Structures are given as C-alpha cells and as structure tokens.
Amino acid sequence: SQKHLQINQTFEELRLVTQDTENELKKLQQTQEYFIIQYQESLRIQAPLAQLSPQERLSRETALQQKQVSLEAWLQREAQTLQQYRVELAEKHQKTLQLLRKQQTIILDDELIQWKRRQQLAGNGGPPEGSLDVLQSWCEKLAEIIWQNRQQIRRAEHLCQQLPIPGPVEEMLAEVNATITDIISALVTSTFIIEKQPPQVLKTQTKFAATVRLLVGGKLNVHMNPPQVKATIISEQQAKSLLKNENTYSGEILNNCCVMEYHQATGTLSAHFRNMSLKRIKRESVTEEKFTILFESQFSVGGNELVFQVKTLSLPVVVIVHGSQDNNATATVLWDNAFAEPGRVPFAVPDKVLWPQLCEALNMKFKAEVQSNRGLTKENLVFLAQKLFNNSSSHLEDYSGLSVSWSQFNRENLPGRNYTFWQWFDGVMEVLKKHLKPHWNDGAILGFVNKQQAHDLLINKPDGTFLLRFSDSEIGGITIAWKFDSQERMFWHLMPFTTRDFSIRSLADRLGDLNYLIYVFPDRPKDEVYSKYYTP
C-alpha cells in the first residue's frame, strides 16, 4: 500500500478529468441548443412584406438586409467558436484516453500478472495469492471510467449530427471511438481469470472444484444476463494451438459446466464449479505429460450487439493413473510452477535451471509439506547439494553456480538406485508429513547429515547421545547415529525406520524401547523431548 497510492492517485486524476470533460460537454450542448434557436431566427428573417409606399419600402428592405448580414456575421462567428470548443473537447477526450491506456496497461499487464504469479507460486506451498478485491475494485474503476467516456463521446457524436460543422472533428471522434472499443476488448478479455484454480495432480473419477471470476462484472452491464461458462480439459498441444487460434476435445468428457452468480454484498460476478469430476482422458511419460482446464464464456454489455467471447486457461494440470505414480507426478508440477516463464508459450519450462533457483522452490515446498516454519537451512542445503552433484564441497557458495538438468533431477538415478534426487527428497517429505511432523518442528531430527558427518560431530558428545539422520540407504527411512564408548567392540546394528515400522510402533516408542539412548544431539535428554509423544 506504498505505491498502490500511485494507482489511486492516477484514478482520482482520471475521475476528475472525465468529470470536467462531461461538464464541458454539457456547456457545449447548451451552446448548440442556443445556436439553433438563433439560426431559426435567421430563417424567419430570411428572404418580403405587404403593400407599402416606395418611401417606407426602401427603409424596411434596407433595415432587413442590415439585420440579415449582421445575423450572418453573428452565426459564422458562433459556429467558428463552437467548432473550436468541439475540437478542444476531442483533444481532452484523447488526452484522457491516453492516460487511461497507460493505467490499464499498468493494472492488467503488471498487477494482474503479479497476482497470477502469486497464485502460481502458492501451488508449490508458497504464500497465498490473497484476495482480488483490490484488483476487483481497480477494474471496476477502470470500467466505470472508460464507459463514462464512451457515453460522453457518443453524446458528442449525436450533437455533431444535429448541427454539423465541417472541420476535422469527425475523424478525431472516429479515431477515439476505435481506441475506446480496443480498450474495452482488452479489459473484458483480460479480466476473466480463475480465482481458485483446480488442484493439479488429479486422478480420474475424483470430484474437484475451481472458481472463475469477472473482475469488471459488477458494472458494465454484464451481470444483467449472467452468462454460462463451460469448462473442458485439453492437452498441451491443444492449448498451444488454441492460443494461436486453431480449431480442434483433447481430454474426453468433463462432468460439469455452470452459470455465473452475482453477490450484491461482495458485489462479485463469479462461477463456482464445486462438483466437477473427470471420467475419461485421451492420452512422453505416463505422468510427465500435462493438460489444462479451459474455461470459456460469452457475454453482452448492456443494450448493445457487443458480444465478447472470452476464454481462460488454468495453470498446467497432470492426470494420474493411480496413486502409485502420484508421488512422481508432483515433481513435474513442481518444475512448472517454479520455472514457468512470464510470456511462455503454454507449458514450456527450461531444462537447465541453476541450483539456488531450485533451492528456493524445494525449501518453499518443504516448509509447506511438513507444516512447520523450520524449513531448510544452509547446512541442509549443502547436504542436498553434495547429494545431487557428487562433489567434495561443504560451502554453499561453491554451489552458487551449477545447473541441475531436469533429467538429473527426476530422470537419471543417483550413484545409488533411488528414483533420482526428487524421489529421495519427496520420501523424506512424506515420512515427516505422515509420521514425524511434530518431531521435525521440535528440532529432534537433524536429518540432513551424513554418516561420517554425523560421526565426527557426535564423537565428543557423552555416552548415550544420538541423532537421527535421513537414510540414503532406504528412500523413506531415518537412521540413528549414537555415542557409546565400547560401541565398536559390540555388535548392535539397527535397520532404518520407515513408514512400515512407524505404522505399528511410532518413533517415540521406538526410541523409548532403546534405553541405552538417552540424550538428543546436544544436551537435550530423550524424555524431555518425547514425554508428550510416548504412548501411555
């Protein structure tokens, strides 16, 4: 709300200029209305009497001729100054439209794109996009202003019809009116946006919902006949070709389609699809290929033949065969939302991406999935960097460059056999989501440490001190590294704990069973950490 004031200041300026231009047009109408009555006086005086003496007739005729030439000189002057006023009106309307064009481009091409990008990022666990009531109010002011100016210009056109003065004013009005229709088309087509987009990575037969909105709908007389909006699922090639306006239905049948509703209190025109269900799908990989939900409608503005065909595209959606593949499919979505270009041709993502750029997305989605504000720290980030690029470095700035190809992210296996770097990271995400979210928030799980790295870090600690790291041995497991003096002369080796283990006994109970483990990493004792989570 710092440089939002810039927008509202420009809006007050626009309001003032349209108001004073309307006042100018009122004065011009009064001027013309008086001019035509004086011109009718000239018509009555035009061309002229009954029987009189030749002495009085000369006087009468010369007085009438005087009145006639005077009235002609008065009319030519009045017409001239009237035309001056008219061209001034056209000039002021032009100026207002130019600045309104700048403002509309500011809102539609920047702020709306910013909000849509907020939405895009929220799909990866980022901050929520927020409410469009600010953008809705802005678009209401835009529509109000431009429609009022259209009314003023058409009124000037009608006024020019009744008393035509040659000049260059008709071309000015024609040029300005075309600009008006162009602006209206841009506004109406650009403010048909998906408020809550439908949740990507969806299976067939499952009910999902999305909500689309018309930001300008409150006014502009679209609400008078709330149009029907139809949703249909189309492939990526279909979306690409449609944006180029081809013709082709690329993803079989969709269950629903609905009509818009207007909340007078909220003052919003929106379409709520609460019960859509995907029942069939046409169909490189069974899971990488992305689709999109297309919403389209058509509506009229007031009493005009002006009909707008509008369409909008959801951000890319992936269709899952069965839950087994779902864990992988989100990876695809993760890249798109993370790395979609601003003016991208539909669903085109870079294959390169630098490491810190991927780090920001991984960290964001991690804090989202584990439902905590702990998140990824620098040491964790170096751990995953050493995991991805087999490279001997323990400083983050050494990995400040480096490009993570999509393949090495999710297609090429690591030096192990884990389903690429993404599967291991999604595995730790899932194990902490379903089982160990509280222990992650509490700080008991260091996790992002290595066996030897956990070792030398843990040697000096007193006997009985443990720490839990995420196993590179198994995908979804965590292992324990412990401190005892005899240790190596003893046997004792434990298997990593996975979801299967955690389902029957749970982590706190497993640690309770092991009496020889008594301190969490630094000085924290076991009971202090796990007392509330032990099973009474």
Residue numbers in the entry: 138 to 184, 188 to 388, 392 to 426, 433 to 685
The authors write:
Unphosphorylated STATs form an anti-parallel dimer/monomer equilibrium, and upon efficient recruitment to the cognate receptor–kinase complex, are phosphorylated on a specific tyrosine residue, which promotes parallel dimerization by conformational rearrangement. The activated STAT dimer translocates to the nucleus, initiating transcription of target genes and altering chromatin involved in loop formation in enhancer-promoter landscapes. The canonical domains of the STAT family are all present with the coiled-coil domain (CCD, S138-T331), DNA-binding domain (DBD, F332-V470), linker domain (H471-D591), and SH2 domain (Q592-P685). Archetypical STAT-type SH2 domains are comprised of an anti-parallel β-sheet created by three β-strands (conventionally labeled βB-βD) surrounded by three α-helices (αA, αB’, and αB), which are also observed in STAT5B.
Notably, STAT5BN642H was identified and validated as a severe oncogenic driver mutation. To investigate whether STAT5BN642H perturbs the protein structure, we crystalized the mutant using the same domain boundaries as the  wild-type protein (A136-Q703). The βD strand containing N642H was observed with excellent electron density and showed two distinct conformations. Alternatively, it is also possible that this conformation is more capable of activating STAT5B either through facilitating interactions with the C-terminal region and dimer interface or providing greater access to the pY pocket to increase phospho-ligand association kinetics. Notably, the affinity of the phospho-peptide with the full-length STAT5BN642H (Kd = 15 ± 1 nM) was ~6–7-fold higher than wild-type (Kd = 102 ± 11 nM).
